[PDB]
Paper text:
Beta-glucosidases (β-glucosidases) are key cellulolytic enzymes that catalyze the hydrolysis of cellobiose to glucose. They are terminal enzymes of the cellulase system as they act during the final step of the cellulose degradation. Beta-glucosidases (β-glucoside glucohydrolases, EC 3.2.1.21; BGL) have been found in the glycoside hydrolase (GH) families GH1, GH3, GH5, GH9, GH30, and GH116 of the CAZy database. They are anomeric configuration-retaining enzymes that operate through the canonical double-displacement glycosidase mechanism, except those of the GH9 family. Here, we report the crystal structure of a β-glucosidase from the thermophilic filamentous fungus Chaetomium thermophilum (CtBGL) at a resolution of 2.99 Å, and compare it with other β-glucosidases of the GH3 family.
The structure of CtBGL consists of three distinct domains, similar to other GH3 family members: A catalytic triose phosphate isomerase (TIM) barrel-like domain (Leu51–Ser354), an α/β sandwich domain (His396–Gly596) and a FnIII (fibronectin type III) domain (Thr663–Gln867) with a prominent insertion region (677–766). A linker region (residues 355–394) connects domain 1 to domain 2 and a second linker region (600–662) connects domain 2 to domain 3. The active site is located in a shallow pocket near the interface of the first and second domain. A molecule of β-d-glucose (BGC) was fitted at the active site based on residual electron density observed in electron density Fo–Fc difference maps. The source of the β-d-glucose is most likely the growth medium used as no β-d-glucose was used during crystallizations or soaking. Two catalytic residues were identified, Asp287 (nucleophile) at the N-terminal TIM-barrel domain and Glu517 (acid/base) at the sandwich α/β domain II. Potential glycosylation sites were observed in the CtBGL structure in 10 positions, all in Asn residues. A total of 27 glycan moieties were found in CtBGL. The N-glycan at CtBGL Asn329 was located in domain I of the enzyme and consisted of eight monosaccharides (two GlcNAc, five α-d-Man, and one β-d-Man). CtBGL has been found to be thermostable at 50 °C and to retain half of its activity after incubation at 65 °C for 55 min.
Author numbering: 32 to 867
The structure:
Amino acid sequence: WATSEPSYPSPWMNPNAAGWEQAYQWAKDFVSQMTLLEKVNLTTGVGWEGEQCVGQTGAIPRLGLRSLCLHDSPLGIRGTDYNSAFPSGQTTAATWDRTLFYKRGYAMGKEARGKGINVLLGPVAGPLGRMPAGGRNWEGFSPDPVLTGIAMAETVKGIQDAGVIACAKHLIGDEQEHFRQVGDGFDIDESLSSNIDDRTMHELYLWPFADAVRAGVGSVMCAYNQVNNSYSCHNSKLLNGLLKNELGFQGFVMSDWQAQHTGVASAVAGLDMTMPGDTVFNSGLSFWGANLTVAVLNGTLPAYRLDDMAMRIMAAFFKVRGTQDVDLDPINFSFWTLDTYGPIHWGAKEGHQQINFHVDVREDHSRLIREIAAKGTVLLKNEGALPLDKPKFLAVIGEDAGPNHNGPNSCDDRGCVGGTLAMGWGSGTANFPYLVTPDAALQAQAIKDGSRYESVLSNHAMETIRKVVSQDNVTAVVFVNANSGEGYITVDGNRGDRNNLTLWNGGDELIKNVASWCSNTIVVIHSVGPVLLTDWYDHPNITAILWAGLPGQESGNAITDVLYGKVNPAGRSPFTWGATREGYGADVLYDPDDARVPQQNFTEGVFIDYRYFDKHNTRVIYEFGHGLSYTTFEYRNLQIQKHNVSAYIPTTGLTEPAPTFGEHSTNYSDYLYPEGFHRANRYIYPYVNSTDLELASGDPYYGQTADQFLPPNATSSDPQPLLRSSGKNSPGGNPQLYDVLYTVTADITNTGALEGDEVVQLYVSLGGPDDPKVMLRDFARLHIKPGETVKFEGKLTRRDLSTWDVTLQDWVIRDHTKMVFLGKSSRKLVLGALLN
Ligand SMILES: *[C@@H]1O[C@H](CO)[C@@H](O[C@@H]2O[C@H](CO)[C@@H](O[C@@H]3O[C@H](CO)[C@@H](O)[C@H](O[C@H]4O[C@H](CO)[C@@H](O)[C@H](O)[C@@H]4O)[C@@H]3O)[C@H](O)[C@H]2NC(C)=O)[C@H](O)[C@H]1NC(C)=O
Ligand SMILES: *[C@@H]1O[C@H](CO)[C@@H](O[C@@H]2O[C@H](CO)[C@@H](O[C@@H]3O[C@H](CO)[C@@H](O)[C@H](O)[C@@H]3O)[C@H](O)[C@H]2NC(C)=O)[C@H](O)[C@H]1NC(C)=O
Ligand SMILES: *[C@@H]1O[C@H](CO)[C@@H](O[C@@H]2O[C@H](CO)[C@@H](O[C@@H]3O[C@H](CO)[C@@H](O)[C@H](O)[C@@H]3O)[C@H](O)[C@H]2NC(C)=O)[C@H](O)[C@H]1NC(C)=O
Ligand SMILES: *[C@@H]1O[C@H](CO)[C@@H](O[C@@H]2O[C@H](CO)[C@@H](O[C@@H]3O[C@H](CO)[C@@H](O)[C@H](O)[C@@H]3O)[C@H](O)[C@H]2NC(C)=O)[C@H](O)[C@H]1NC(C)=O
Ligand SMILES: *[C@@H]1O[C@H](CO)[C@@H](O[C@@H]2O[C@H](CO)[C@@H](O)[C@H](O)[C@H]2NC(C)=O)[C@H](O)[C@H]1NC(C)=O
Ligand SMILES: *[C@@H]1O[C@H](CO)[C@@H](O[C@@H]2O[C@H](CO)[C@@H](O)[C@H](O)[C@H]2NC(C)=O)[C@H](O)[C@H]1NC(C)=O
Ligand SMILES: *[C@@H]1O[C@H](CO)[C@@H](O)[C@H](O)[C@H]1NC(C)=O
Ligand SMILES: OC[C@H]1O[C@@H](O)[C@H](O)[C@@H](O)[C@@H]1O
């Protein structure tokens, strides 16, 4: 069995780090004036359903700070009205456009701010996408680390310039939604452990988080799963050794809802804030809260650690926002209802006022949502069918093309299929302000165009369909979908995770039938991820296939732009379209197989998605980074310019000893509930109810000093040595990792008749017997006019060419023959040269 090695003590903030020096100072000037009670309020959630947002902290009224509001989603504001619904992160990734990564972020952030949210619970790098059938991979960006890391840095930078606090979501493992928690139909004693060896962790799953740390993300969420059999929220090597030690993360770490299962041990493991605060939803008891105060008071949790917890939360707050002000606008919505009036303490039915204000907060974001959705559509196949000109008879076919007869928001958290699919289910959702359905957008295009339009919005009226598409001169566009979501909603026996990689609602045989009766058949797929196209992609009557992903509120208008050439395709697949499911290598584990704790050995190593296909030459139908245009592009004249140099010297030194900020009284009666006080039911408070700390806690396991149940040095205050693989005041790793060793340029020439975008992609091969054949390392999206030639330049950093040595515990550049390639895809590599 795998074990998680201990890394202690929990690193405290560096006052000279990166872009936090000022935010550190302002936090220092603020937490210094906090009582122990107030520190426990900022770190402990009020309990599930306790307030307005999906998570809220204790307030600090004496210092003028209201409760902090934390809320979903990574694609728009969840559970409220007059928000926008942006396209998924997966689809956004498919644009391969950093500008759009950022614009979507700043967009989402501005809406969260307008509602009064202080922490937006996004963007997502866990799951990265280890298995195509994973329930939530669509919330992320790509199974590929470089594209995902770029998308994260850019989305985080957007969210926070708005500016609310961004949250790098689900720290590592959690590539699957089965067994993420316990119970729920299965007999497992603990959550699944995904076990990841050290090299895999550094150059695959942690890679994007590094990028989020280096971009300045204010918070990080730990995940429900264990890693080497200790929950990510109790994990020393992960939270202390990797995130806060090596990458030097300066912000605060919050828990996934009910992901914390221990109090003090979790605090020194690295957890700064527990959410929504209970031990368990509606239980009224906390592993922190009252337990947190008696932990300091009885000596076993060092004072410096709770000050660090406070320092991190308040530093994040001050890093965004950018003024020393606290003092926020009111939280103007409520998550638990849409009613205008209701209990502000929803769970307890206490505090009946106006909790919903219906603030339009939408701006003109529909322009951006429609642009991203179109520029993120992938044109998979095009045998002379597209763009559509003025078809005499256009016939749209499929349920996915129509309205949910029950309305766009009929199902809470999007937990059902019906009509068009524009969004997966789970927390990663928002309500649509409207949902432009393809039927309506295409019909209106055809009418303006003078065409004849008929639609059959069913997957099963077969003879009805036949009569429609058999007629002379028919252009048939057929809409099919596949879905997944978070594990707490089962839609048609899919327990969050996809059961299989085929289309839902019999889309396969719907396509096979339409292609059977019509010679110009176009397939559009709305889906959470790849679907096996094997039985029908090469049909001679299917003349084009497009993947439009999860486009959000403007899905209809976006696919019309692409079909009629208003927007020229360019979108590249953020994943591989394989022929079998075994061809992807790793797979979801749907059954614990009598095991008490399901174990997931990540023995595929760094070989997920296209890396796996390329290594074992399993069959690929559309490769990673594939996408077509209505024009053509000629790559010529490769140039690699090598910068000298600067030797990679280690890092190096010794930190400052753990500080204290403010003081705490030792008169236990100071922490009793104030005399008049009224306890909202099940609300999580910081006050003790007995001057007997053992009784105050009510923990039946009470009474051991830190040396009896915490590992060595777990509370140590002494200066700690600096890790070889970090930078001194440089969060993200040894800053020489990001020196540019090579500049790579080619000449990209549009050779078609229509203007368009091109997604030049940069791949490297690091020699190496255990290495992939190609790894993506840079990319660029260029706009080129028909006659034009354009200079693409890419960069390769010292990290870009490195392997993680575990003996050395750093990054090295081994002495293997190494090469760089430029391609139109993972496989369509047209230029290559030796890196000298
Ligand atoms: C000071 O106050 C704090 C706050 O309440 C109080 O903390 C609690 O401490 C106990 C230790 O006494 C913690 O409980 C243990 O937790 C660890 C990690 O989860 C377990 O390994 C421990 O196992 C013991 O007993 C088991 C049963 O035989 C064995 O299997 C095991 O090997 C161990 O012997 C035990 O479960 C508890 O988590 C915290 N509570 C919170 C909310 O943090 C502390 O005890 C007080 N200190 C003093 C000196 O009074
Ligand atoms: C999950 O477990 C794996 C393996 O138990 C952890 O990976 C291992 O990480 C340690 C460092 O944390 C590596 O240690 C080094 O060992 C070399 C000898 O090979 C030694 O010379 C060095 O001094 C160094 O200590 C270890 O090699 C590595 N093992 C593998 C197979 O990669 C992993 O970090 C664990 N993850 C978590 C979150 O606990
Ligand atoms: C820790 O956080 C909690 C929750 O945010 C804080 O509790 C809030 O405290 C105020 C007063 O301290 C309570 O106000 C009272 O309402 C009555 C009428 O019901 C009114 O007469 C009072 O003047 C006051 O407005 C408020 O209800 C309470 N919130 C809850 C949910 O109970 C607490 O103060 C924080 N502790 C510290 C040390 O900052
Ligand atoms: C802190 O703890 C004390 C006791 O540990 C709490 O006080 C007590 O509350 C219980 C009920 O919650 C009272 O007991 C029983 O209550 C019913 C309903 O009133 C009563 O009719 C029965 O005859 C029976 O006594 C108990 O009398 C009461 N004792 C005292 C001294 O208050 C206290 O409420 C807790 N404080 C907070 C802020 O939660
Ligand atoms: C502090 O944490 C402990 C557990 O770490 C909480 O303990 C519960 O106490 C009840 C009392 O009957 C037991 O039945 C449970 O087994 C205990 N553990 C749980 C619920 O996980 C304790 O309530 C916490 N203190 C406060 C004030 O919430
Ligand atoms: C491609 O589409 C055409 C229809 O446009 C299919 O052809 C018809 O085929 C049936 C039986 O094969 C004949 O009875 C009809 O007279 C044909 N009509 C026309 C207009 O050709 C053709 O079979 C389709 N191809 C495939 C592989 O299914
Ligand atoms: C301790 O606190 C209580 C209430 O907060 C107060 O009434 C009492 O006088 C204090 N005692 C000492 C010795 O400070
Ligand atoms: O609902 C709010 C939170 O709790 C859970 O539902 C999800 O796992 C989280 O990702 C989410 O941020």
